[PDB]
Design a protein around this ligand. Structure first.
Ligand code: HEM
Ligand code: HEM
Ligand code: HEM
Ligand code: HEM
Ligand SMILES: O=Cc1c(O)cccc1OC[C@@H]1COCCN1C(=O)c1cccnc1CCO
Ligand SMILES: O=Cc1c(O)cccc1OC[C@@H]1COCCN1C(=O)c1cccnc1CCO
Lengths: 141, 146, 141, 145
């Protein structure tokens, strides 16, 4: 549940990603795969290598996805319906993995957006990412 | 925990640039802001009503420095983190009753603070190494519960 | 996020609780205090002896709040906003404690209403109480 | 861990458990209530529906094995660390099951005990069992500590 403030924070913080959506997305992944290798078990069809255009391009959609999740923040279950099916029904992603990706995304934001990663914004982003994580791991069709 | 010699080198170079009188307080303040129920353990600390109050709170800054000092003790004793934190564990699991999920949280907040301070220097390999460290510390701190 | 079958499961199951709501609240409360003694530290002014009158009055309030969440299962944040203020702002309950109490609520239902506690109803009830717990531990005012 | 009156409580109740049924119901309910665990069982076939899951013969057979594990934990509450030392290796080092899932299974078994024994599963009996299942999940996760 985000306060009105939380949504302005994520709106404001996540907007500054901008063209770098791809880049931050890919790095967050790279961060997760190196820091938490078990998460590779979900991507055996990917090229794990650093700089791998499959990782790089996948990151672009997660960021858009999240941009879209920021875009339908108060409609997120309807808006993330397809990704729920993918992640909860089809892939069966264990929910801890969302906490790992969520942390790597925060690390990336902290590393690339220091002026915007204030404590208030950090807390809003964590709740936002937890909210996206709850939607993606729940079967509600 | 076993870091590769290059992880150990990268970890120690970054750490040596850590502001030992601030980072500890940033990490604790963020814990209390991002995970507001942890403030339950620090009602002795005074004003926590707002994020700026949390971060500016002298008691927070104070207590954060000693926490940073333990993470330092841990870094110097990576192969024996249980021993190093044996007494600390007694304090956090037997006396305080802190649910050990929160130890993972602080460790991950610290990583976010290291990222904040060091930017690009806090690369994914470097982060990978520190995740190893803070996972080590949290569980040695949780050891009693094991 | 509750599915449509989730919502009808919860509502039909709660109906069968009926007049025993307060009874099951107090038992879940006792189970929790005995099974997880750290939770008692949230009730230092409560006489926690077996058969305690404070535990029984309180079980009724909890049951009534859950019944109200069932009634308002589509607008839970709004309908529980005073209880989130209490639990998230003033009490600052660790979310782990909501999992302990939800688990004890399920144990109580499984003990008293075995016909209703199908696997599917179990799944639906679990998400519902996870949902309530998320509202009550979020600061969104 | 268990005081005398506790051990005798859990002992007595565990005597009445159907050892060809409850193990299977706990596993099946794990797979239903916490569906992402299904990922660990694409070898087991039909897990599409609650009724499909709860009737899967391998789900039942496997559940017998886990209740067997629990039976073995109850036997040696002295040293479940060593008791489950081999299982911990398989669950942690080999299959990489997050240990929160260990806690979830124990709580489901506890549910399933309450579901079967009803009023006999008193708050005090649950409390002793909670110590037991936490010991099994801990011991099971020893290779993570
Ligand atoms: C905030 C968390 C996440 C978001 C927003 C997210 C978003 C997305 C998006 C947008 C897609 C592709 C949609 C399309 O087909 O156009 C996708 C695919 C995928 N996501 Fe996620 N995801 C998240 C977390 C995870 C996690 C934690 C995992 C696994 C550990 C995961 C695994 C996948 C996989 C395996 C795919 C499919 C890859 C492919 O074959 O293209 N995701 N995700
Ligand atoms: C995860 C790593 C953690 C480390 C390294 C750590 C470290 C320490 C240290 C070094 C002390 C000081 C002991 C002394 O003064 O003699 C301490 C005290 C304390 N820690 Fe932690 N701690 C951790 C986690 C936590 C968590 C998660 C909480 C609460 C959520 C917590 C709450 C406290 C409290 C309340 C005190 C002392 C209270 C007081 O003196 O006023 N700690 N910690
Ligand atoms: C879904 C779970 C819960 C519900 C529905 C719930 C509901 C309530 C309700 C209705 C009240 C009293 C409201 C009032 O008097 O104005 C209350 C108070 C309280 N709740 Fe909760 N609660 C839940 C979980 C928890 C948990 C897990 C804890 C702690 C372990 C907790 C601790 C308290 C405390 C300490 C009070 C105030 C007691 C008093 O002074 O009378 N609650 N809760
Ligand atoms: C928590 C208590 C648990 C106990 C006591 C337990 C015990 C066992 C036992 C006795 C086996 C049989 C070894 C064999 O197949 O030869 C086993 C296998 C397995 N367990 Fe567990 N287990 C537990 C929890 C879990 C959890 C939480 C999961 C994952 C969600 C899991 C997944 C498996 C899998 C996938 C296998 C092997 C599947 C196969 O042989 O095809 N177990 N476990
Ligand atoms: C609203 C909403 C939602 O619809 C879905 C998920 C979450 C939501 O809100 C946030 C929740 C409940 O409130 C605060 C905590 N929290 C956590 O999930 C949590 C619990 C423990 C540790 N860390 C976190 C991450 C939050 O930062
Ligand atoms: C589902 C679900 C779950 O399985 C476990 C825990 C919590 C869940 O949902 C928690 C919020 C709490 O309030 C009502 C329900 N709800 C949502 O539907 C939701 C989920 C994500 C994002 N946004 C929302 C709407 C407002 O947060």
């Amino acid at each position: 549940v985000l306060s009105p403030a939380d949504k302005t924070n994520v709106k404001a913080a996540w907007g500054k990603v901008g063209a770098h959506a791809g880049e931050y997305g890919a790095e967050a992944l790279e961060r997760m795969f190196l820091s938490f290798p078990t998460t590779k078990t979900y991507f055996p069809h990917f090229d794990l290598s650093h700089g791998s255009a499959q990782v790089k391009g996948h990151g672009k959609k997660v960021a858009d996805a999240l941009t879209n999740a920021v875009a339908h923040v108060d409609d997120m279950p309807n808006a993330l319906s397809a990704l729920s099916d993918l992640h909860a029904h089809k892939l069966r992603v264990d929910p801890v993995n969302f906490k790992l990706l969520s942390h790597c995304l925060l690390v990336t934001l902290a590393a690339h957006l220091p002026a915007e990663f204030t404590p208030a914004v950090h807390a809003s982003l964590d709740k936002f990412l937890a909210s996206v994580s709850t939607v993606l791991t729940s079967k509600y069709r | 925990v076993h870091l590769t010699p290059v992880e150990k080198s990268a970890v120690t170079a970054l750490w040596g640039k850590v502001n030992v009188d601030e980072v500890g307080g940033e990490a604790l303040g963020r814990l209390l802001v991002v995970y507001p129920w942890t403030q339950r353990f620090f009602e002795s600390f005074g004003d926590l009503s707002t994020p700026d109050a949390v971060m500016g709170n002298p008691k927070v800054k104070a207590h954060g420095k000693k926490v940073l000092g333990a993470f330092s003790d841990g870094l110097a004793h990576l192969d024996n983190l249980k021993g190093t934190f044996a007494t600390l564990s007694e304090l956090h699991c037997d006396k305080l009753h802190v649910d050990p999920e929160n130890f993972r949280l602080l460790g991950n907040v610290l990583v976010c603070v290291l990222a904040h301070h060091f930017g690009k220097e806090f690369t994914p390999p470097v982060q990978a190494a520190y995740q190893k460290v803070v996972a080590g510390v949290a569980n040695a701190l949780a050891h009693k519960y094991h």
